[PDB]
Design a protein around this ligand. Structure first.
Ligand SMILES: *[C@@H]1O[C@H](CO)[C@@H](O[C@@H]2O[C@H](CO)[C@@H](O[C@H]3O[C@H](CO)[C@@H](O)[C@H](O)[C@@H]3O)[C@H](O)[C@H]2NC(C)=O)[C@H](O)[C@H]1NC(C)=O
Ligand SMILES: *[C@@H]1O[C@H](CO)[C@@H](O[C@@H]2O[C@H](CO)[C@@H](O[C@H]3O[C@H](CO)[C@@H](O)[C@H](O)[C@@H]3O)[C@H](O)[C@H]2NC(C)=O)[C@H](O)[C@H]1NC(C)=O
Ligand SMILES: *[C@@H]1O[C@H](CO)[C@@H](O[C@@H]2O[C@H](CO)[C@@H](O[C@H]3O[C@H](CO)[C@@H](O)[C@H](O)[C@@H]3O)[C@H](O)[C@H]2NC(C)=O)[C@H](O)[C@H]1NC(C)=O
Ligand SMILES: *[C@@H]1O[C@H](CO)[C@@H](O[C@@H]2O[C@H](CO)[C@@H](O[C@H]3O[C@H](CO)[C@@H](O)[C@H](O)[C@@H]3O)[C@H](O)[C@H]2NC(C)=O)[C@H](O)[C@H]1NC(C)=O
Ligand SMILES: *[C@@H]1O[C@H](CO)[C@@H](O[C@@H]2O[C@H](CO)[C@@H](O[C@H]3O[C@H](CO)[C@@H](O)[C@H](O)[C@@H]3O)[C@H](O)[C@H]2NC(C)=O)[C@H](O)[C@H]1NC(C)=O
Ligand SMILES: *[C@@H]1O[C@H](CO)[C@@H](O[C@@H]2O[C@H](CO)[C@@H](O[C@H]3O[C@H](CO)[C@@H](O)[C@H](O)[C@@H]3O)[C@H](O)[C@H]2NC(C)=O)[C@H](O)[C@H]1NC(C)=O
Ligand SMILES: *[C@@H]1O[C@H](CO[C@@H]2O[C@@H](C)[C@@H](O)[C@@H](O)[C@@H]2O)[C@@H](O[C@@H]2O[C@H](CO)[C@@H](O)[C@H](O)[C@H]2NC(C)=O)[C@H](O)[C@H]1NC(C)=O
Ligand SMILES: *[C@@H]1O[C@H](CO)[C@@H](O)[C@H](O)[C@H]1NC(C)=O
Ligand SMILES: *[C@@H]1O[C@H](CO)[C@@H](O)[C@H](O)[C@H]1NC(C)=O
Ligand SMILES: *[C@@H]1O[C@H](CO)[C@@H](O)[C@H](O)[C@H]1NC(C)=O
Lengths: 240, 42, 339, 47
């Protein structure tokens, strides 16, 4: 489990070193803040119906009575250009706030805890996560247990023994084709079916697909070794 | 002789799979993998 | 999950096929390309939203040939081969209870030639440089993704979400669920034929409910209606005058000459261009409200379909057992199953 | 039963605790193992 984690985090170095495009979700924030301001500074070149977009040409060439009627075209279009930028920035800011609230939620639930949420903290059953900072962002390294090398087994919902039906305490019943076992659900690790591997309810007629097998009692062979201890005392006690 | 050119295609949604379901069969993992994945948030 | 992928051509909208106005639009600069860029930003995002809600599955899972799942009757939520589009029975209710004003597919002008263009407002939107683009994933593809999420769920429970699909008998999967809500699994096996009848009856009530009323799909129809209302308002805004002598550029160019015609055209460009700045602001605000729904729908897809939820009232009302996704026009319907 | 329940402390610390029997699944069969022992002793008077 250490060699798996150590070699898996080793591939993160290459996943970041080899491709250019890995942090595209953060580069796009920088690119939009740059392209919005680069657009806003090009809008100073727009004439909006005036004789020049350069405000000093108006003020060089005309007197107040018609200079102000040209200037007001540029005040109107420039002011609209700001009104567009600030509306666009408020619309983006409200999307980055949703991403910050999600990131603070992942920090709370994946980093400060362990989450049962399916695919919330990356694909697999979540173990833990490590935060790493980035320009305008956070990158979480999520660590997950992902099952592997499955085998087919035959199974049953219950085992029938003393005419009583037995159900797994924890785990599931399985057969390799000749023997019956309990195993934990998420990892094949078989054990003999016992009074402690199981619990009981009702006779074997209610359940559909119930199968006949013995259930071992961990008390009985040891109580029987104590019967044979009592029995050797009785046989020897014929001598005194 | 071969040469790169523009093609168009109907996109695949994923690989085809049929699950071997039967009313007494279970599949259980005999091993695990530990995997690390990046998630990037602005 | 998404809304209609509109596009606008600002030269055609503001003053199509007049060079005498095209040469004045450039006095404002990039106010067109900023709006085209904003609407393209939204239009590319609708396919991201559709991908993040439905493309949660690695592989296209198929159900087995023998359709027996411990007595639970999925026959109306699974797809049937007999229909042209391989949608389920309940998906075919939903696909009809929402009426699409313009699907965005090809229009060969044979509709827009002759009388239908007087009776149709969609053809008149097209004539003013407003169009609806198709989604990337067709209603067959979304239904196919949905059939894989559903086939995985019944044949393998949560396991296809965490790793490879691992088969388990449905009555044992439902028993693993019962343990999950803290009702010990012997309660399922002692009642399985009752639990199956209860589920099979509850699925029957959904078919009848969706056949009986339209008002339940209001959340999807309202999205189509607000897109159609916005393109109808935006094409009506061509009829306004903004203080110019006329609302029609052909009249202004037929009735004047350049030195005062350009004074009328400045008003109509300034008004029409403001009529786009408003539309694109409403669409950006709608696009953010839809995303906040597509991210919720993807979160329910992961935590209700691919899993079982401890979150109270998140995956339906009750203690959550499991959920089935169904596709709808521009949306998703979850059939949340609860104890 | 002593399987269904776990012990802690004594009856004076809990508020609203009630008296009842608590059964022990080992006792009835250990006591059958006494009837098994006792019959053998009563018979073993004869050899
Ligand atoms: C299903 O799993 C079973 C448990 O792993 C396995 O049964 C075990 O098989 C071995 C032989 O491969 C037996 O080994 C015994 O061999 C002789 C028998 O006389 C003894 O002298 C040895 O001491 C040793 O016990 C195991 O005893 C046997 N286990 C049990 C509980 O019977 C099956 O073979 C597996 N079946 C398949 C199809 O793989
Ligand atoms: C699982 O093990 C069970 C216990 O051995 C076994 O039950 C036995 O089934 C037979 C046949 O149904 C019964 O035989 C009786 O059937 C009728 C009366 O009900 C009479 O015509 C017969 O003469 C005979 O009395 C047994 O009584 C019954 N065992 C007990 C203790 O009642 C199951 O059949 C086994 N099932 C499988 C699939 O292995
Ligand atoms: C569970 O999965 C593990 C891999 O994800 C696997 O570990 C790997 O085991 C093999 C041997 O079976 C090792 O392979 C090397 O073994 C020797 C050299 O030591 C050579 O003969 C081989 O050619 C090959 O180079 C891997 O090194 C090893 N990997 C790790 C990280 O330990 C386990 O064996 C699997 N466990 C079970 C119970 O199946
Ligand atoms: C799962 O639930 C389904 C809905 O109740 C059910 O399908 C329905 O089955 C009945 C009985 O076969 C059909 O009734 C029709 O049967 C034939 C059809 O050719 C006609 O002769 C009859 O007059 C009658 O109309 C329903 O029409 C049918 N409904 C649908 C939507 O297909 C399935 O049978 C159930 N699955 C199982 C395994 O029981
Ligand atoms: C738990 O609640 C169940 C209902 O949610 C209930 O199931 C229903 O039981 C009644 C009988 O008590 C059945 O009624 C039918 O019974 C026979 C025909 O089989 C007729 O005499 C009656 O007129 C009537 O048709 C219902 O059909 C049955 N519903 C289902 C879905 O199976 C359970 O019985 C309740 N159990 C307990 C222990 O309270
Ligand atoms: C639960 O069961 C307990 C055991 O039977 C019982 O405790 C007993 O309570 C009585 C009354 O308080 C005590 O009786 C003594 O009270 C005083 C001295 O403390 C004397 O006046 C009496 O003559 C008598 O000696 C018992 O000593 C006490 N026994 C033990 C072992 O603590 C509880 O009262 C029962 N409670 C309920 C609610 O059922
Ligand atoms: C699990 O088994 C199925 C097939 O059933 C098995 O049949 C025997 C060979 C034996 O293994 C029995 O115990 C099983 O009941 C496998 O599905 C088949 O896979 C092959 C490719 O390996 C494919 O060509 C077939 O078309 C498949 N058949 C079906 C019905 O799907 C499945 O791959 C096995 N699972 C694992 C994890 O090994
Ligand atoms: C038999 O009993 C005697 C005492 O009476 C004791 O010394 C001896 O060790 C016993 N042997 C066995 C096999 O029990
Ligand atoms: C599951 O059980 C039903 C009812 O007994 C049976 O018809 C069907 O053949 C079984 N399924 C398979 C895959 O055999
Ligand atoms: C008593 O012991 C003898 C063997 O010594 C045996 O034959 C007999 O059946 C036993 N009887 C009882 C009641 O245990």
């Amino acid at each position: 489990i250490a060699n798996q984690f150590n070699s898996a985090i080793g591939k993160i170095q290459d996943s970041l070193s080899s491709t250019a495009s890995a942090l595209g979700k953060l580069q796009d924030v920088v690119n939009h803040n740059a392209q919005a301001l680069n657009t806003l500074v090009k809008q100073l070149s727009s004439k909006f119906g005036a004789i020049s977009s350069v405000l000093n040409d108006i003020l060089s060439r005309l007197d107040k009575v018609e200079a102000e009627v040209q200037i007001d075209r540029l005040i109107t279009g420039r002011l609209q250009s700001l009104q567009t930028y600030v509306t666009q920035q408020l619309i983006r800011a409200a999307e980055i706030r949703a991403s910050a609230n999600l990131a603070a939620t992942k920090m709370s639930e994946c980093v400060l805890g362990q989450s049962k949420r399916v695919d919330f903290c990356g694909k697999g059953y979540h173990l833990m996560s490590f935060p790493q900072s980035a320009p305008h962002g956070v990158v979480f390294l999520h660590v997950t247990y992902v099952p592997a090398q499955e085998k087919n087994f035959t199974t049953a919902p219950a085992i029938c023994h003393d005419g009583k039906a037995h159900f797994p305490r924890e785990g599931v019943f399985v057969s390799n084709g000749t023997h019956w076992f309990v195993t934990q659900r998420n990892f094949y690790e078989p054990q003999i079916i016992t009074t402690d591997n199981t619990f009981v309810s009702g006779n074997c007629d209610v359940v559909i697909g119930i199968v006949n097998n013995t259930v071992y009692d961990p008390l009985q062979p040891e109580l029987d070794s104590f019967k044979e201890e009592l029995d050797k005392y009785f046989k020897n006690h014929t001598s005194p | 002789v071969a040469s790169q050119s523009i093609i168009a295609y109907t996109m695949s949604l994923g690989a085809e799979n049929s699950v071997a379901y039967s009313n007494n069969s279970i599949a259980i993992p005999t091993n695990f993998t530990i995997s690390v994945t990046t998630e990037i948030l602005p | 999950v998404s809304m209609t992928k509109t596009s606008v051509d600002c030269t055609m909208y503001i003053c199509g096929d007049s060079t005498e106005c095209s040469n004045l639009l450039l006095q404002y600069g990039s106010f067109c390309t900023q709006l085209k860029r904003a609407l393209t930003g939204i239009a590319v995002e609708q396919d991201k939203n559709t991908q993040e809600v439905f493309a949660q599955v690695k592989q296209i899972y198929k159900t087995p040939p023998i359709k027996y799942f411990g007595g639970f009757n999925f026959s109306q939520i699974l797809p049937d081969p007999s229909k042209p589009s391989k949608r389920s029975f309940i998906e075919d209710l939903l696909f009809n209870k929402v009426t699409l004003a313009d699907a965005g597919f090809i229009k060969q002008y044979g509709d827009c030639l002759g009388d239908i263009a007087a009776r149709d407002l969609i053809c008149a939107q097209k004539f003013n440089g407003l169009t609806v683009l198709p989604p990337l994933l067709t209603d067959e593809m979304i239904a196919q993704y949905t059939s894989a999420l559903l086939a995985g769920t019944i044949t393998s429970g949560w396991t296809f979400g965490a790793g490879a699909a691992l088969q388990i008998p449905f009555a044992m999967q439902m028993a693993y669920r019962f343990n999950g809500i803290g009702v010990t699994q012997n309660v399922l096996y002692e009642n399985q034929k009752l639990i199956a009848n209860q589920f099979n009856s509850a699925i029957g009530k959904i078919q009848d409910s969706l056949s009986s009323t339209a008002s339940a799909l209001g959340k999807l129809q309202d999205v189509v209606n607000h897109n159609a209302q916005a393109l109808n308002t935006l094409v009506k805004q061509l009829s306004s005058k903004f203080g110019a002598i006329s609302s029609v550029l052909n009249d202004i160019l037929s009735r004047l000459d350049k030195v005062e015609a350009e004074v009328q055209i400045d008003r109509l460009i300034t008004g029409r261009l403001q009529s786009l700045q408003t539309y694109v602001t409403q669409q950006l605000i709608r696009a953010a409200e839809i995303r906040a729904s597509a991210n919720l729908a993807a979160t329910k897809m992961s935590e209700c379909v691919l899993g079982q939820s401890k979150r109270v009232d998140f995956c339906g009302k009750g203690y959550h057992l499991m959920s089935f996704p169904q596709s709808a026009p521009h949306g998703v319907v979850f059939l949340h199953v609860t104890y």
